[PDB]
Amino acid sequence: GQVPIANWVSSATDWITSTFSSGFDVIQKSGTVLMNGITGALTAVPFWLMIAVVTILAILVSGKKIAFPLFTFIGLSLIANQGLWSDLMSTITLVLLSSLLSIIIGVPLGIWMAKSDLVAKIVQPILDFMQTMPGFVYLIPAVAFFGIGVVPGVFASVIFALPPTVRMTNLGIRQVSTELVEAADSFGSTARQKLFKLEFPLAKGTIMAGVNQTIMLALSMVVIASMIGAPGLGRGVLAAVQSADIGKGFVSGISLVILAIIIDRFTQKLNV
Amino acid sequence: GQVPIANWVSSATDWITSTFSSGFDVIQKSGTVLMNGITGALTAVPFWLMIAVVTILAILVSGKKIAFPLFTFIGLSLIANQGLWSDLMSTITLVLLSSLLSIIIGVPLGIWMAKSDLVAKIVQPILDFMQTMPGFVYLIPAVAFFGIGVVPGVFASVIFALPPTVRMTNLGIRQVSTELVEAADSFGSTARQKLFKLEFPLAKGTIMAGVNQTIMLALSMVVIASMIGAPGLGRGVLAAVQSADIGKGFVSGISLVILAIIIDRFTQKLNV
Amino acid sequence: VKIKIEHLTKIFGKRIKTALTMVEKGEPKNEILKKTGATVGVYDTNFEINEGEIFVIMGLSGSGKSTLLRLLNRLIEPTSGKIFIDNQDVATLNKEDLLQVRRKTMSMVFQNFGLFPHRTILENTEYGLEVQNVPKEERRKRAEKALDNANLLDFKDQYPKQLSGGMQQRVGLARALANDPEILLMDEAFSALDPLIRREMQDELLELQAKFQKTIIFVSHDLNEALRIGDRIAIMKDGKIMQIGTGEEILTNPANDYVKTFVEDTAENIMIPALTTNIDVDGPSVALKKMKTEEVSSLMAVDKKRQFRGVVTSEQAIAARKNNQPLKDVMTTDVGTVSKEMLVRDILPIIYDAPTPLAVVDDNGFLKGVLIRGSVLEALAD
Amino acid sequence: VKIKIEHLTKIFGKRIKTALTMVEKGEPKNEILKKTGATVGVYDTNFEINEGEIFVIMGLSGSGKSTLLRLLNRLIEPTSGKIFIDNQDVATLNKEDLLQVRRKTMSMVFQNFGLFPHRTILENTEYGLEVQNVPKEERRKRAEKALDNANLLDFKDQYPKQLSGGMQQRVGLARALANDPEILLMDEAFSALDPLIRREMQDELLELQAKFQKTIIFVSHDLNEALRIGDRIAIMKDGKIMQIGTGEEILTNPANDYVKTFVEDTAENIMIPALTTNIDVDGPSVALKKMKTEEVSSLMAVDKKRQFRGVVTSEQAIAARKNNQPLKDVMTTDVGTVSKEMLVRDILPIIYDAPTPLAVVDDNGFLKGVLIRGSVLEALAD
Numbered sequence A, B: 001g002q003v004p005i006a007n008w009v010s011s012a013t014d015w016i017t018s019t020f021s022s023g024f025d026v027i028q029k030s031g032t033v034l035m036n037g038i039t040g041a042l043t044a045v046p047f048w049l050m051i052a053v054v055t056i057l058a059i060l061v062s063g064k065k066i067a068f069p070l071f072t073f074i075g076l077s078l079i080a081n082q083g084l085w086s087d088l089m090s091t092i093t094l095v096l097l098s099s100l101l102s103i104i105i106g107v108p109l110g111i112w113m114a115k116s117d118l119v120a121k122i123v124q125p126i127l128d129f130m131q132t133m134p135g136f137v138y139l140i141p142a143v144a145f146f147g148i149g150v151v152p153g154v155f156a157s158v159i160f161a162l163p164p165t166v167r168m169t170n171l172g173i174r175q176v177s178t179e180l181v182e183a184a185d186s187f188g189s190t191a192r193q194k195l196f197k198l199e200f201p202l203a204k205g206t207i208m209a210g211v212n213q214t215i216m217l218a219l220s221m222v223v224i225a226s227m228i229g230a231p232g233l234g235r236g237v238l239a240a241v242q243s244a245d246i247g248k249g250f251v252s253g254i255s256l257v258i259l260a261i262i263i264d265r266f267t268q269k270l271n272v
Numbered sequence C, D: 001v002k003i004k005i006e007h008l009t010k011i012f013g014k015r016i017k018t019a020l021t022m023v024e025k026g027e028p029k030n031e032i033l034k035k036t037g038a039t040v041g042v043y044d045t046n047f048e049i050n051e052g053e054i055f056v057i058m059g060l061s062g063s064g065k066s067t068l069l070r071l072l073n074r075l076i077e078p079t080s081g082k083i084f085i086d087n088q089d090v091a092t093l094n095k096e097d098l099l100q101v102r103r104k105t106m107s108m109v110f111q112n113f114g115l116f117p118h119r120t121i122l123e124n125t126e127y128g129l130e131v132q133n134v135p136k137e138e139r140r141k142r143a144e145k146a147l148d149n150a151n152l153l154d155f156k157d158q159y160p161k162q163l164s165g166g167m168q169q170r171v172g173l174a175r176a177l178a179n180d181p182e183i184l185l186m187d188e189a190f191s192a193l194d195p196l197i198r199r200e201m202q203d204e205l206l207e208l209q210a211k212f213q214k215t216i217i218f219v220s221h222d223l224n225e226a227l228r229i230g231d232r233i234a235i236m237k238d239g240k241i242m243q244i245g246t247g248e249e250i251l252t253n254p255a256n257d258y259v260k261t262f263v264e265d266t267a268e269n270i271m272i273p274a275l276t277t278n279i280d281v282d283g284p285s286v287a288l289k290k291m292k293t294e295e296v297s298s299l300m301a302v303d304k305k306r307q308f309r310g311v312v313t314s315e316q317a318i319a320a321r322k323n324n325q326p327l328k329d330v331m332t333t334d335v336g337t338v339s340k341e342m343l344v345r346d347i348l349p350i351i352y353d354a355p356t357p358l359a360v361v362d363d364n365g366f367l368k369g370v371l372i373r374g375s376v377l378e379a380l381a382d
């Protein structure tokens, strides 16, 4: 016999939209404009200046070796060249938004989890359930709630890249040697004290690792959401797919890669 | 000024197809038929028997606890119910193919890497470059070479899920305590000897972990390739996306999840 | 008197009210476990402590001893009981007062020293005050002072991992002392060090306690580490088997039959490892180096084939050296060498003649050990 | 003679031909490093070895000593040199012959014992033959035999992690012996054990070498671990500073000025840690337990305030026990107590009167150490 999970889910969705309409709407409004604004700003700057700024930044992080800043300048020249700049800046605003949201919404959760053994049981299952899902589903409720655009994309990205942030957090916090915990507590240190003197300064490594992971996940999720609003090179690669156009697909994907590699080589070197 | 990476890439692609045409063609032929054959087999079986078989298998792995086999039977009943069975079996043949190919093509690479410090330098960059890419690109050369279908999808899945397999391999092999290496060597043990007595039996944990990871990656890549041939619930979720149909999208994705969770809970419990 | 305990105990697992009621009647630990699965670490513990009264706590891994400490500090909340310090219970204190207590009265030392590798020894030392919201001047002052008191200040503004275990132990100890606590909890502190550094630190701790008279919960699984310092010992097997202390009463009037196997209370199995000198290869200078390291005045002499040969003395070696003569000639083959199995009053008339011990040479010339007045002990036990 | 070495050396990093040519002329290591960045571990090493001639190799962490071993076994390919074993070079051997050699002649022991935790002690023992493609019968037979020879067979068909360091060391040693090798390479084997187990294993190894006369490269950073057994020592600071051995020639005629600071070749800094007994708290039984553990016949007596008080003897304690009398009355306050800074030949006559040492009591009553005929040594050094 059949069970109506489709209808249940449909109905639930219907009910929600049909209750939180205004919230979603204003949220949409704010999101898009902000994103539009941000995009307009970046895309106000030239491309040359931006490349040179990133290049210096590379030197700053890595003063001696020559490969990464070299490659960064090269690829950004190339990307500016093919004309995929406005789309690039759309992609970057999308990411930054999704990543910051996922951080701001997960790190406290890693805290609450490392503190309570109940929340761990409640969430770990949710975390695996979300870490195994595909991206494709996440963006259907996105349009269901906000509709087409950037807002839905960053929503999906957040909900897709939160898990590892939260996980690595709770882990880097539950893995501090119990001696130091006991010590901090033996001198009458409130949770805040040890937390901002002992826990973070140590777990920071794993935290930034999970954060890099979260950023990459948000990036892939945006490349996906491109099939719904979500400007950026995702649209170019998508068109190339739906048109079998090898050239532009490879080109959009290579620009995306360059971007992601750069973001990584930056993040890695911000941990210590 | 512009540089013609599009044209270069286009030209290269053109040249290859236009050289290895017959290979690709026969490979296609063999792939699809085999896949078709496998699918036909796996669909030949009823659904009820298959569920009960998987259920016993669950009990076998986990004799006491009742949650995982229970849930497996439940979700498979549900999946058989909505009618997503033939597509499911297409997805499973796709995965098994991609996963076995990626294993058979990466494990030796983890070997060669843990043995030679050159190959590590050569490959690690390739591994990061491929672990940061999106899936979307991978399937454009897939059609470029084989065309529409399952073959392209499993190709993409393999090339997308190889990296972590290879990485965890080379790592679990380079992380055995040097004392045991030196010992195996002090008694005149050829590389094969220590390798099949010492290296594997230890690195197996990390190896199976990277393999589980590889399987999940292949799964996501198939869900993606659904946009090109690649039957399975990927098509259902895709249609739901391109049609905003919440019900069927959620339903396909939940069946996929159930499948992935099951594959995990199986893999995890095959390490020791 | 400083501390006082009353029916204190701690229970782990779940379904702990039943276990509480059980111990309220005398239910053994094993039965409680089987019936509830709530493993107990402490069981109806009642005792007190006085000032300057180093109160060691012995036991085997699993006797739940460190747990008792973490209860006293309340790091682990007690299932029940009371702790009357300064006319002030401790298990019925709010958070503020408990923190102030931990800050003023108590302070801990740990096995692996509980040090923050991401700080400088100075910072780890002053943490106890940092968390008390005090200016940095006096913080650094008291820190430098405590460190000078341990003769490692110059090693400050460094990190732990680049030091030796002993230094890190001294560091944690100074960290605990900075607060001028009236109490010091110690959880197998010196158990991670070398036995030499162990004795050194024991003596330093005694010197401290002489200067500053403050109470100490010490913990250890080594009876010697306790007897050297302990003024009132307390043995522990999931309960206070014996806590009378006195050091000897545990050995004089051991109430239970398990303490006596813990302290190890007729044959000559007392033969001890010997100090050898293979004359066939080594020389006087070498024998003197060995006498110096082993910190003795004489040695036993064997053959290259491990066959007993005789005895050597410091003066004999010095004479052979000045004369440049070798061993095997400047020796004492005349010795009261004995066999492994004999009576405790066997070599009674000779043990006094030979100032040197009486090697227990194997029947076939091989050597096992020696005897230095440890025969008297069990000989008079009759 | 068994082994023979010729201009052997090893260089790390890159650009090693230049470093080779450099050492072919005598270029110091530091300059080679600065000019090429090719750190060297071995430098123009030339010596030989004989049979049954335990050839220890000392040095500090970085002297590149274990490297020399792994070169002898060829685990690390030599940059240059030759190794003439059984009239058969080793650096010019193909793979087959090198493996057969490693299987027949040589066998290693390691610091952390190099054990396969995923096997049973029996399997780890027989591995050396397993890799030689031999039937399981004789494999298990030789294994059980070697284990019985170490008195742990019953502990077989278990795993390492559930054992003690000493047992795992014995296990690796049996694994190496099973092959009946003519050689045994050892890389700080006993450096991971307790010094007591260390001495026990040293003596067991000597007994073995007595039974079976086979060559041994030993390695250690402890000069005593070498002097106890070493028949021909070789000190190492990136090169053979001294290899003559003889045990004493290193101390008798130390050629270089760095060996003499390695072996530690006018004030009375020789005061050694003392054995105390706080009469104010402890009793005769306790003092006897301490005499037993410390393995001595007498003790020093202090006050609860660490103030020196006198001396105790085993017989005095036994008498106070039988009589039930306490300490502080059955003692010897009459003693040749001395101060920290006395002249080289200060208590030159009294040291002989008092059989017991002469405690170096601090000016203020405190105690630091004692003196047992270690004064004679440096007194006659003049």
Ligand SMILES: Nc1ncnc2c1ncn2[C@@H]1O[C@@H]2COP(=O)(O)O[C@H]3[C@@H](O)[C@H](n4cnc5c(N)ncnc54)O[C@@H]3COP(=O)(O)O[C@H]2[C@H]1O
Pocket: C272, C273, C274, C275, C295, C296, C297, C298, C299, C300, C355, C356, C357, C370, C372, C373, D272, D273, D274, D275, D295, D296, D297, D298, D299, D300, D355, D356, D357, D370, D372, D373
């Ligand atoms: N920190 C310390 N280190 C060493 N001794 C300390 C000490 N503090 C106090 N003493 C006492 O001083 C005496 C020094 O004895 P000496 O070393 O001249 O004479 C020693 C030594 O030359 C020799 N000996 C001691 N232990 C030995 C062993 N394990 N193997 C071989 N010979 C040994 O036999 C004599 C036995 O002396 P006994 O035990 O009657 O007496 C010892 C010991 O009881």
